[PDB]
């Protein structure tokens, strides 16, 4: 933590911004997958999305 130089916390800030960008990208990929899957579930077997879930 406080053992790092100014230049070293700057590089770490850079590193964590890169990373957080990648995590946001991944979240969007997961969200997209979910929505695309759900379109098919909703059109084909919407009962799957019921709460509580009852299998057919």
């Amino acid at each position: 933590y406080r053992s790092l130089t100014y230049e070293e916390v700057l590089q770490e800030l850079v590193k964590h911004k890169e990373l957080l960008r990648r995590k946001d990208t991944h979240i969007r990929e997961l969200e997209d997958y979910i929505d695309n899957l759900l379109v098919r579930v909703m059109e084909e077997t919407p009962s799957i999305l019921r709460v509580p879930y009852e299998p057919s």
Binding site: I34, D35, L38, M42, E43, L49
Partner: protein, 167 residues
């Protein structure tokens, strides 16, 4: 069985209390630590209104994003919609016209819409005057009600009204 099966959708900004309105109506349950809804789901409740038994099929999804791949299927066959805002957050009310446009663009012309001001329990934090929202609803031909999923006020009345107004 039932005399009628009505699909109703919940819409409105993230955080306004859609999922807790659903849980309160269908199970008389409320969760203070509820998180943004992932995916899409529905829950059912049968009720006696006007001497008829209506199976209400209530759909729910997060309101983080107005339009998604699931939006058309979400609105498809829906005959009722609860358009919900948070009385304690004026921004959620400002966005009501945007949600109304999403309806007008993707739902049936004859969908019955009920404007719902939720979190009425937060009296001390009110940011949307009742008269303001009621006037908007009137102008736009929408029924209007204030609810609290937390303390249960008007939750059944909101759903009862819209289900009634679909027949």
């Amino acid at each position: 069985e039932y005399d009628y099966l009505f699909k109703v959708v919940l819409i409105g900004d993230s955080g306004v209390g859609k999922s807790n309105l659903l849980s309160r109506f269908t199970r008389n349950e409320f969760n203070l630590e509820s998180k943004s809804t992932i995916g899409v789901e529905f829950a059912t409740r049968s009720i006696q209104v006007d001497g008829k038994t209506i199976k209400a099929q209530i759909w729910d999804t997060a309101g983080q994003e107005r339009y998604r791949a699931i939006t058309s299927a979400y609105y498809r066959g829906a005959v009722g919609a609860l358009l919900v805002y948070d009385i304690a957050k004026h921004l959620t009310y400002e966005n009501v016209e945007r949600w109304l446009k999403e309806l007008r663009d993707h739902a049936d012309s004859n969908i019955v819409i009920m404007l719902v001001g939720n979190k009425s329990d937060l009296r001390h934090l009110r940011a949307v005057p009742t008269d303001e929202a009621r006037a908007f609803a009137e102008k736009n031909g929408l029924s209007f009600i204030e609810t609290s999923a937390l303390d249960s006020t008007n939750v059944e009345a909101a759903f009862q009204t819209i289900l009634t107004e679909i027949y």
